[PDB]
Design a protein around this ligand. Structure first.
Ligand SMILES: [Ca+2]
Ligand SMILES: [Ca+2]
Lengths: 585, 585
């Protein structure tokens, strides 16, 4: 078996792809990776590669040349992966180019699995027009815009989820730092990767909750979702019972570890909160009108950009924040602080969502910022519209906010800065240890969920090759809902009257972050074991706890909290801890 | 005798020119071709050429240099041909440049025959301002914009006509594929080229129809038009009788084969349907206003482009669709799906034509597409406004439409994609055999009239040198009407009250495609010979049948039909066949 990787192939992209391919995964001996570029050979740089991995071959040529496709033997190949220029000049033009490859690869041999990256959502739709494109077979398209947005959105609900859900996906091994610092605990979690496995015949008929306990208690495998016979269910309630050989998504250290588990108020779907399309000027707040309202528990997304910028795809940020699993009362209002000229062009996708607001002005003016009462928000998202040196602004905005005093203090505000250049992470937190060479996942600002780069998702490519499900899990988890045709035929979203079959869909779980201090399970804090809590939390409310969001201190000063994924049954808690979890509805 | 070729002379252009010059034509020994470029000599590449053809000489220099013109001896030369940069950066600038050459060549020696290519129609007019320019002598200008448009227009009336009328013009020989596939039948037709010949004294006084039968039955030469003594008549009625030595246009395999034939509701002209100039906003349909009307039997021309694009010259697409040979009832309404900003600038030429509509929006949104009820149209033209890699859009649009389901199916819609790069043909039909090297005329999508490139017309250059008439035939045939001064003085077109002399001009024949199933001559189908049908069809209704538009199957599935030009008197029909023909009025 062999695969064909093509599209934007750079030294950096190849090296990154190879790392993620061959780590803890069960078998790597099987697949030969054949890269196909059209750039200058650079035989020397390639020469060494071939020596380290005997599974790697380089050929130049186009994906649009029937001879070259035959030369690389695309027809026989297990799958073909099309890498995109994430940091492209014109995003629309890039997708346009990539779509053509898909068309071509399908033209040569239709029965091929194609994994492809997409920069803009709206373009992802086009892929369905291609005859040979099988959404139901292996063909899948990783939309970078929609996922980047969703990950940041999921952080508004539970701060730090973005980086927790990212480290979980990138294949990485255990490090075991000897000295006592947060690094130790953070990395002990990082060591995770999320694997797919079939449930043992033993579990058949049991309730998911009881199965989940057995897996965690008897095996130390944190189970999060089943694949009912098809639709997938994340943390089902106690009623769900196992159907012969069910497929389960586990979060364990190594791939071999998981083997052991074998012994009109709504959208047409009723998934998202629909609202009558509103005219943009009805939403625009004056600086005063905004300062008048004391907003809190809201999301302040402040975007830089002018009329001639790439569309960030704000649709995908608000959508998961408007899922039906939250009550209208619970919904967080969203305030965009940007240029009106920029906003309006994107606006057309958002008019349907409720509690959306625009305050024209720059994220660098405190006047605009004080007006929207940042001190009070649950999350402040800082985005840079697309030369990457010009993201200097985001750092400035971030630093600005940290140095305010509301009368609370600026440094204690939930911020999440989207960075374009992983190197720039050094700057946003100014007490951390800095080095340009140090990987992003290891930096403090990332560990805490203060920062997030498009870079992080590149790992998904290989990961979604191995398990189709993985990609459909995350997309489902991150965006709220998923179907595509209603969404595809029109980019504008249809809203309908609720049927008892639609009001039924509200039953999906939801991400939340909880405290031990006010907790019903509070008694466990102040020294109790996480293992003892987890089970209690599960059986009593059907809650899944998969992470502690601890302060970076074990004297006390800072508020910054870092992420610990899937801690062991014997893990000492503290009163200050917070719990990442999936609650029922 | 010798000729001077100048202007845009590339390796590709030269090789193409030489192929079309020296094939089946009666005598090639007579003419020496002298190329005059101004690019870097590249003596080596040229060296070989001179060795294959002893009729070819290369000289560098300008056409604007009196010395160089004398050196190439332009004054003695039979004719001078000016090739243009079809795939130019700025079309207007290219014509500007070419016109200057014409001016210069005329300045040096006025009594010269000049054949020249023009990219935009509006510029073609300017050539009349040049004193030495003789529209009545040999001087003729092949306007690429007007012909490309007309060929596509002619396909709306009879699908596949574009490629039938193209293969007919490019000098090509018989191939005789042994195996039974559509290629065989298609190529047996392709082997045609349309030649000019004088009628034998024998035919004098007979009716065209009876002459036509004799030519087809006794000689196997399909005759299509006479040149009455001057004006030319395509398929005249039975009344027209031969005047001594008449000139006739025949469609035969070889040039020597033809030798054997020797043994206010209207425009000022009353040629085209005039309508009071309408204000653009009166024509613009909302998406709703359009979805409201169930349009069918119409043409959906959907153009990509913004305000800063080259003008496609839509005038020339609608004009042949608005000829007076059709009743107002019979007229096909035209819907443009594009950017309003782009359209309005072109619009000013169209306000005069009736049943014209604009639906602002992109050909990639199904909303806009479903609104205009594509399922129902007789033809859907896909155009790309002018870097040629950016025609990727046309393929996308084409694929989009094929994958829709109206509730009919998307794949069964009459589409014609204008391609800029002959190579890209591979992509539009995804069941055909693909190879970049394979010539365009041989590709399935072209064989069927699904695709059409500006490339195809390059053959005309040499062909119109040999017979002035040929060019005036096609232009007359393709655009409906032809005179130039009324059209030239103002680009806007004058409409007048009809006189009985103008209402007389409506008598021109018309292209149409007919079925055997519903046919009056239906009985001949299901096994009968085409020869037996042809004559019957001619004598009974004065119809000329010149082609079968057969399905590509001889089990059944596909709807795609390919073109067979001038089939023999002994040709087996089928019920599924269609007939290309010229009907009377
Ligand atoms: Ca720092
Ligand atoms: Ca093809």
């Amino acid at each position: 078996k062999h695969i064909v990787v093509c599209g934007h192939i750079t030294l950096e992209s190849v090296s990154n792809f190879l790392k993620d391919f061959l780590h803890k995964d069960r078998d790597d001996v099987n697949v030969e990776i054949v890269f196909l570029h059209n750039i200058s050979p650079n035989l020397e740089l390639e020469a060494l590669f071939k020596r380290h991995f005997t599974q790697v071959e380089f050929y130049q040529g186009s994906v649009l040349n029937p001879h070259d496709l035959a030369r690389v033997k695309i027809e026989s190949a297990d799958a073909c992966l099309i890498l995109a220029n994430k940091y492209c000049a014109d995003p629309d033009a890039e997708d346009a180019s990539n779509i053509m490859r898909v068309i071509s690869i399908k033209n040569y041999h239709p029965k091929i699995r194609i994994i492809t990256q997409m920069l803009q959502y709206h373009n992802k739709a086009h892929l369905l027009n291609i005859p040979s494109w099988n959404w139901k077979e292996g063909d899948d398209a990783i939309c970078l815009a929609e996922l980047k947005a969703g990950f940041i959105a999921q952080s508004c609900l539970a701060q730090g989820l973005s980086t927790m859900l990212a480290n979980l996906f990138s294949m990485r091994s255990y490090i075991k730092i000897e000295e006592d610092t947060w690094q130790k605990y953070y990395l002990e979690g990082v060591a995770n990767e999320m694997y797919t496995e079939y449930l043992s015949s033993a579990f058949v008929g049991l309730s998911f909750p009881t199965v989940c306990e057995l897996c965690y208690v008897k095996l130390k495998l944190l189970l999060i979702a089943i694949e009912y016979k098809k639709r997938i269910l994340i943390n089902p309630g106690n009623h769900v019972k196992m159907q012969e050989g069910t497929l389960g998504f586990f979060i364990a250290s190594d791939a071999k570890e998981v083997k052991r588990a074998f012994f009109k108020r709504y959208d047409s779907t009723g998934m998202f909160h629909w609202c009558p399309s509103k005219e943009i000027e009805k939403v625009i707040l004056t600086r005063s009108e905004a300062s008048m309202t004391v907003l809190s528990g809201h999301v302040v997304v402040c975007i830089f950009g002018d009329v001639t910028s790439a569309l960030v795809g704000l649709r995908n940020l608000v959508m998961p924040l408007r899922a039906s699993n939250f009550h209208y009362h619970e919904l967080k209002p969203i305030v965009f602080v940007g240029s009106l000229d920029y906003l309006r062009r994107e606006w057309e996708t958002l008019h349907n969502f409720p509690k959306v607001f625009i305050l024209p002005g720059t994220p660098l003016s405190r006047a605009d910022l004080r007006a929207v009462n940042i001190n009070l928000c649950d999350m402040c998202v800082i985005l840079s519209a697309n030369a990457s040196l010009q993201d200097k602004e985001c750092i400035l905005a971030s630093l600005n906010i940290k140095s305010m005093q509301f009368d609370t203090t600026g440094s204690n505000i939930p911020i999440i800065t989207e960075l374009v250049n992983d190197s720039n992470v050094q700057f946003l937190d100014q007490d951390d240890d800095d080095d340009p060479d140090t990987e992003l996942y290891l930096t403090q600002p990332f560990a805490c969920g203060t920062a997030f780069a498009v870079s992080v998702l590149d790992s998904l490519m290989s990961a979604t090759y191995f398990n189709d499900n993985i990609l459909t899990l995350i997309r489902t988890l991150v965006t709220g809902g998923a179907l595509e045709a209603l969404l595809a035929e029109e980019n504008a979203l249809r809203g309908g009257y609720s049927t008892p079959q639609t009001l039924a869909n509200r039953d999906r779980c939801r991400v939340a972050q909880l405290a031990l201090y006010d907790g019903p399970f509070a008694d466990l804090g102040d020294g109790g074991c996480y293992g003892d809590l987890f089970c209690k939390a599960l059986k009593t409310y059907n809650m899944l706890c998969f992470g502690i969001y601890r302060l970076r201190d074990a004297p006390s000063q800072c508020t910054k909290r870092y992420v610990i994924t899937n801690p062991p049954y014997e893990f000492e808690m503290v009163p200050t801890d917070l719990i990442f979890c999936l609650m029922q509805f």
